[PDB]
């Protein structure tokens, strides 16, 4: 048996997973927001007031071109059409 | 805009006491005035809400405890005032219990909160305000979350344009990982009332990341940053996004923003984790341990401890404290997210060091199942399974080692490891692998072959029949 080092993989060294990892957003289930029942002011509902522009953008429902015709291609040509006057 | 003047009917006198909000005296005098006046409960609620708005909860707390006993309910609308006054204090206890970071304090406040919430149920339960308050109280614990779901659901049924009930349903939708309903309820809840603390809008930004709308999340964070600079969650999300950008300048500016947020609120666990990961590279491992330990103790949720512990364990791996690194790597893996696998890598290394080859392979197998293309884990897994008594694993070790050798033309140890298992059934393959290893040793390493490789090559030749080469 070849005498491999007994702690060749124990020693810390740069790894691919070190730079390829991804960080995640972890927060409390309610996410720093609670129902402010204490204040009736927040309980008031005002439909007359205009909606914020960002809020309108969010309301848009989500549903789940070739530039070849315009390529120059020098050799090709165009096509004229019947005109009442011609030489 | 005038704040307004509170009017109180004086006992047996037509004159009414008028007090403007701006110059309202201390609540200690107001409580005695009301007690000697025997006024209606709605005046107490108005004064209670005024001192709550002033930012002093102690004044509001004191007048509400004193009011609930000596109230005057000799009028038509006494029941509604009584319900609101009791429920306000009960729900404030729940909110204050949530605010504190000590579990013991939570239970002490929760005790009186439960007593007072049961009392409110005694008189009237169908009241919408009482229903939402009970939903919040039951949501706080977390074991009564389904009751909050049902309560917010039928409260929402009562009124569609109702931000608090819809907000609770959206929060519960987030908790149960119902992403579409959560997003829909949040959008509609924000529509109901544009006037609301910016915290609700923070829930939008993160939801966009939950839907992978990174540019949308960036825009949401920018709008959050513009409107309110005191939102720690928004800064944390922006810093996390910059971290996820994976760019040196992005990391540097994200760390500065993380420091600013930690200065704003050092008690938040998540913010500290991102900046401590940078500290690891700064070589100030003592500060790394401090920040990692600080974040791990501060939080109360299990998902958070996935990161901090890892970093600490990682920090402990370069301090050669393999036993404590082992234990803390195990803690990080025990409370881990599917998105995080590095703790399993570190835990496999610790198990490898301790001699727990089988469980180390299990951790590495988990990492491989999560991420099957990593080269480092592939090499380690190939080596570890090569020295396996079971025959079936030798083929997998061969495959891993073959995969490693193809990806890496120059890996003497991988070639030797592959050869040591090709010997069992593939004499020519083992000979080819040993020859390749010898070629790299002579070419790059520029060292004479080890005697063991020469002996094994000769033994393979003997098995083949090349006695002269043997």
List, as ranges, residues 32-71 from A with C-beta within 8 Å of B. 32-47, 49, 51-52, 54-55, 58-59
The token duo for A39 is: 């204040």
Query: Residue B388, Cα to own-chain centre: how many angstroms?
Result: 39
CA distance A65 to chain B (A): 22
Using an 8 Å Cβ cutoff, are B10 and B16 in contact?
yes
CB-count exposure of residue A67 (10 Å: 0-12, 13-18, 19+): exposed
Resolution to 1 decimal, in Å? 2.0
> How far is Cα of residue B389 from the mean position of the Cα atoms in its chain?
42
What H or E segment, with its residue span, contains residue B19? strand B16-20
Which chain B residues touch A3 with a CB distance below 8 Å? 452
Burial pattern B121-158, b for ≥16 Cβ within 10 A else e, equals eeeeeebebbbbbbbbbbbbbeeebeebbebbeebbee
Distance from the Cα of B277 to chain A's closest Cα (Å) equals: 11
∠ CA B214-B216-B221, rounded to 5° = 90
Contacts of A22 in chain B (CB under 8 A): 244, 339
Q: What angle do CA B412, B417, B418 make, to 5 degrees?
A: 100
∠ CA B379-B380-B385, rounded to 5°: 100
Residues 6+ apart with CB under 8 A from B141: B110
Nearest C-alpha of chain A: how many angstroms from B233? 8
In this complex, do A58 and B240 lie within 8 Å of one another by their Cβ atoms? no
Please state, in angstroms and rounded to a whole number, the distance separating the CA atoms of residues B102 and B99. 9
Q: Which residue has the tokens 């490789």?
A: B453
Question: Which single residue is written with the structure tokens 């990080």?
Answer: B332
For residue B243 the two structure tokens come to 């971290």
Cβ distance B136 to A7 less than 8 Å, yes or no, reads: no
Question: Which sign does the torsion angle of CA B157, B163, B166, B172 carry?
Answer: negative
Cβ-contact B142, B172 below 8 angstroms:
no
Distance, in Å, from the CA atom of A56 to the CA atom of B145, rounded to the nearest integer, reads: 31
Any idea which residue has 């404030």 for tokens? Answer: B92
Residues of B in contact with A51 (CB under 8 A): 191, 194
B358 is written with which tokens? 């089988």
Looking at the complex, report in whole angstroms how far the Cα of residue A20 sits from the nearest Cα belonging to chain B: 9
- The overall longest dimension of chain B from CA atoms, in Å, is 127
* CB–CB contacts below 8 A, A to B: 155
Candidates B313, B321, B340, partner chain A, best to mutate (most A CBs within 10 A): B340
Neighbouring C-beta atoms of residue B92, cutoff 10 Å = 22
Q: Are the CB atoms for B346 and A4 separated by under 8 Å?
A: no
Q: CA B426 → CA B395, B419, B460, distances in Å?
A: 12, 9, 10
Q: How would DSSP label each residue in B24-66?
A: ---HHHHHHHHHHHT-BHHHHHHHHHHHHHTT-HHHHHHHHHH
Among A28, A48, A45, residue whose Cα is nearest residue B165: A45
Beta bridge partners of B16: B9
Chain A nearest-CA distance from B414, in A, is 11
After which residues does a break in chain A occur, C–N more than 2.5 Å? 64
The three-class DSSP label of residue B5 is strand
How many Å apart are CA B141 and CA B148, to the nearest integer?
10
The answer to whether the CB atoms of A2 and B193 lie below 8 A apart is no
Shortest CB distance from B209 goes to which of A4, A25, A43? A25
Q: Which residue of B has its CA nearest to A36?
A: B164
Cα angle, residue A32 at apex, residues A35 and B184 outer, rounded to 5°: 65
R_g of chain B computed on alpha carbons = 33
**Are B193 and A46 a contacting pair at CB < 8 A?**
yes
Distance separating alpha carbons of residues B101 and B91, to the nearest angstrom: 18
For residue B90, give the chain A residue with the closest CA.
A38
State how far residue A15 is from chain B, nearest Cα, in angstroms.
6
User: Which residue pairs from B279-287 have beta carbons closer than 8 angstroms and sit at least 24 positions apart in sequence?
Assistant: B280/B311, B280/B314, B280/B315, B285/B315, B285/B318, B285/B319
Q: At what angle do helices B179-192 and B199-210 cross, to 10 degrees?
A: 150
Residue with tokens 């707390």, as numbered in its chain: B61
């Amino acid at each position: 048996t070849y005498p491999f080092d007994q702690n060749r993989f124990v020693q810390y060294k740069a790894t691919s997973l070190e730079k390829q990892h991804k960080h995640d957003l972890l927060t409390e289930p309610d996410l720093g927001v609670t129902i402010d029942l204490i204040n009736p002011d927040t309980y008031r509902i005002d439909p007359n007031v205009l909606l914020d522009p960002a809020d309108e953008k969010l309301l848009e429902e989500e549903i789940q071109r070739s530039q070849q015709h315009a390529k120059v291609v020098p050799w090709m040509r165009k096509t004229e059409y019947i005109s009442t006057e011609f030489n | 805009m005038s704040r307004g003047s509170i009017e109180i009917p004086l006992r047996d006198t037509d004159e009414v006491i008028e007090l403007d909000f701006d110059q309202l005296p201390e609540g200690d005098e107001v409580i005695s005035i009301l007690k000697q006046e025997h006024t209606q409960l709605h005046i107490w609620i108005a004064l209670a809400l005024e001192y709550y708005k002033q930012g002093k909860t102690e004044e509001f707390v004191k007048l509400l405890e004193a009011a609930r006993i000596d109230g005057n309910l000799d009028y038509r609308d006494h029941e509604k005032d009584q319900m609101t006054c009791l429920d306000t204090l009960a729900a404030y206890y729940v909110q204050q219990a949530r605010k504190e970071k000590n579990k013991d304090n939570k239970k002490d406040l929760i005790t009186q909160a439960t007593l007072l919430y049961t009392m409110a149920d005694k008189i009237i339960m169908y009241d919408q305000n009482h229903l939402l308050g009970r939903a919040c109280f039951c949501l706080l614990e977390g074991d009564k979350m389904d009751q909050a779901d049902a309560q917010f659901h039928f409260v929402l049924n009562q009124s569609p344009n109702n931000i608090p009930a819809l907000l609770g349903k959206a929060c519960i939708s987030f908790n149960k990982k119902d992403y579409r309903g959560a997003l829909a309820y949040y959008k509609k809840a924000l529509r109901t009332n544009p006037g609301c603390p910016a915290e609700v809008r923070l829930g939008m930004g993160h939801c966009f990341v939950k839907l992978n709308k990174l540019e949308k999340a960036r825009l949401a964070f920018s709008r959050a940053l513009e409107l309110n600079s005191k939102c720690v969650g928004a800064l944390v999300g922006l810093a996390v996004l910059e971290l996820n950008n994976k760019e040196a300048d992005s990391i540097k500016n994200g760390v500065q923003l993380l420091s600013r947020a930690y200065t704003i609120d050092p008690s938040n666990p998540m913010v500290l984790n991102h900046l401590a990961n940078h500290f690891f590279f700064k070589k100030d491992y003592s500060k790394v341990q401090h920040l990692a330990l600080h974040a791990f103790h501060n939080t109360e949720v299990e998902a958070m401890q996935a990161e901090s512990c890892y970093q600490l364990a990682r920090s402990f791996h370069v301090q050669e404290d393999y036993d404590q690194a082992f234990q803390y790597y195990y803690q990080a893996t025990q409370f881990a997210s599917s998105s995080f696998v590095l703790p399993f890598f570190g835990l496999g290394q610790m198990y490898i060091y301790r001699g727990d080859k089988e469980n180390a392979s299990q951790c590495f197998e988990k990492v491989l199942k999560a991420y099957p293309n990593n080269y480092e884990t592939m090499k380690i897994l190939g080596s570890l399974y090569a020295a396996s008594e079971d025959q079936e694993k030798r083929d997998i070790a061969k495959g891993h080692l073959k995969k490693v050798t193809e990806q890496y033309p120059d890996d003497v140890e991988a070639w030797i490891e592959l050869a040591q298992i090709l010997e069992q059934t593939d004499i020519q393959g083992a000979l080819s692998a040993y020859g390749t290893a010898t070629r790299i040793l002579q070419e790059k390493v520029q060292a004479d072959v080890p005697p063991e490789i020469l002996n094994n090559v000769g033994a393979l030749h003997f098995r083949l029949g090349n006695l002269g080469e043997a």
